Symmetry: C2
Subunit: 388 residues, 2 copies
């Protein structure tokens, strides 16, 4: 996961095309996609409105470089600033690049207050990216070992445990960074009380709160960003994946406090990064989310999704606990059943799921999902589970 | 920095601003848009893939990605391709691969030798390979284990080598830090040295690669092959994509890398783009065009050095050229005057004009650049 992925970790399936919530392999087999390409394809596949906006921009301009302005980029930044409720957007090409941008920003914020070598508190069981800065933010020595030494100055607390955070704070701490919903060690949403405690701690100590919304952001929680459920605002947030619904784009957004103390004289005061194509995509995502009432759809269907998963937990002893937020759900399985084998049976049954944690199923359906697809998922997954 | 120009669209080698003013583009979006703008065949190939699938994740296979890797492996002359989203991500991947290579040989915490005036990217790993302390200062500490040699000076490299050195990385033509091509003999000496010490030679071809030098990759001019190379920018001709490519030696010393079914990144859309770039390059004989026109391009820049006292030196390779200006004339103002004259140039180095025209350039366009640049130079 930290570097190059070997054959045994990938699926023996060649995908060719998609339509709505379905993906088709090279044998024309139709699968219900309940993974969204790992939380990326919020609008499913070949969404007519999305594809039209992308194609129109292809015929206009793909790339300008940061040396010039483009209206698409300004409009996309405005959209994301409004949705995140932060102030200044910096577009990147990926989630991991956004994480790097956030780290640099937090380091510079500290440096400008005369704190050199700002340190980071992150959380065990999280993963933030494969580039060397982001990789320094994972506690698992396994993901790091051959690449050390990495970025020093990172310490690891326990997710949802405020006392473990307080214990590690000092005069040199520049940021606390958390995924709003963990995945690496299993799906695990940040508690509302924990997000509030962190916001208060960060206020009191002038430490930057960094919300990593790459996996859970852009509508999947039923709000644009999962931290909204806790009614706090971070000082910096990162977003990617569904931000571009399939196009390569990422961003780190910072509030006015950070902006006023980290950007130097020479700042043009405008958006940084991005290109006209992917930003046309970002604008499309926001416009379509609004028109098709996608947040409303997630909120409407989340109770049914959770109910359906809980029914499977009731029916099968080896299905243990469900955790999740909106359309980001996880189900832990007993060691008596291998998750990879459950996933194989599902694929045979024309259902695409993925895993996380020790032995857990992960559910990340497209946000355009209908109730009928939840029933289809339940039917196919039930058939798989019955064989164990 | 940012110019006060809003770009809206382009056609061929021309870009248009939001007032419909037409500019000759001699920068290619900083070396990215090799096929210029709105190439009809390129765009048709992209839109075709938009209608199929944009994204799979690395858990599944896709024919476009396999074909793109095959194309890049062949053009590079290296064994395995790992796609990323950007140049800086490719550098990070190359660094990790180099460290892991040494790690498996029993050498922990492999060190890197980079070169002064280099630029490799903005992410924390790539930034560690950047020479100037002013890019790094507030972000420190960065990745430990980087030392900096003098470019084209094999002696300075030898002095920095030790038991922990796992890689020597260079741009085949230094760009952002001032246009400066690696000398043939220096590249051969690096290859020889890396061979003898089992140190990985990493060629950063992000700026100078994908045909700009007249060959697919600039290191081909030295008739050497690196152990790892990085590509981006023109690799996608406007689409966001990067790659780090490794040879058999590196692949076979990594369980994951040597595995034929292995992957890093990439997606069907950008990889369809990569395949279109290779098909078009071949079909339209892009490399031949660069070789045909480079002499005339260089001649035209040379004619400006003779003409204007403050135009000092020209250095370059193929369609990557730089022209240094005396301290007496600020390059930023020359660039502004060129924009008035409807020509888009950029800068590099201490006070230098950087020329990165689209590879679809025609002789006529060089004459246009000359007349507009001369007009600007005459005003100083
Ligand atoms: Mg409690
Ligand atoms: Mg709590
Ligand atoms: Mg049960
Ligand atoms: Mg419904």
């Amino acid at each position: 996961q930290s570097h190059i992925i070997p054959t045994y970790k990938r699926f023996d399936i060649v995908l060719e095309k998609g339509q709505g919530v379905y993906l088709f392999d090279d044998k024309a087999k139709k699968y219900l996609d309940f993974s969204s390409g790992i939380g990326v394809c919020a609008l499913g596949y070949n969404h007519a409105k999305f594809n039209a906006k992308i194609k129109a921009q292809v015929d206009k301009l793909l790339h300008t470089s940061n040396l010039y302005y483009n209206e698409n980029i300004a409009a996309a930044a405005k959209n994301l600033a409004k949705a995140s409720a932060l102030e200044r957007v910096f577009f990147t090409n990926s989630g991991t690049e956004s994480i790097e941008g956030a780290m640099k920003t937090a380091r510079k914020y500290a440096f400008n207050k005369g704190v050199k070598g700002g340190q980071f508190i992150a959380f065990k069981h999280s993963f933030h990216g494969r580039t060397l800065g982001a990789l320094s933010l994972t506690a698992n020595e396994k993901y790091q070992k051959p690449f050390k030494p990495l970025i020093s100055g990172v310490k690891f607390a326990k997710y949802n445990d405020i006392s473990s955070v307080e214990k590690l704070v000092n005069e040199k701490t520049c940021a606390i960074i958390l995924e709003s919903v963990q995945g690496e060690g299993g799906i695990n949403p940040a508690n509302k009380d924990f997000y509030k405690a962190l916001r208060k701690l960060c206020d009191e100590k002038d430490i930057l709160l960094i919300a990593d919304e790459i996996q859970c952001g852009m509508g999947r929680s039923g709000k644009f960003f999962a931290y909204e459920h806790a009614q706090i605002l971070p000082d910096i947030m990162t977003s990617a994946k569904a931000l571009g619904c399939g196009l390569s784009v990422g961003a780190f957004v910072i509030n006015q406090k950070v902006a006023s103390n980290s950007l130097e004289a020479g700042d043009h005061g405008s958006t940084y990064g991005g290109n006209p194509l992917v930003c046309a995509g970002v604008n499309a995502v926001f416009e379509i989310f609004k028109e098709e009432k996608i947040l409303e759809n997630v909120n409407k269907l989340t109770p049914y999704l959770e109910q359906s998963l809980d029914e499977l937990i009731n029916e099968f002893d080896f299905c243990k606990k469900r955790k999740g937020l909106g359309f980001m759900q996880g189900l832990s399985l007993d060691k008596s059943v291998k998750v990879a084998k459950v996933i194989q049976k599902c694929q045979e049954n024309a259902l695409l799921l993925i895993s996380c944690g020790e032995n857990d199923l992960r559910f990340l359906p497209p946000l355009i999902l209908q109730k009928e697809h939840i029933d289809e998922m339940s039917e196919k997954l039930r058939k798989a589970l019955k064989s164990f």
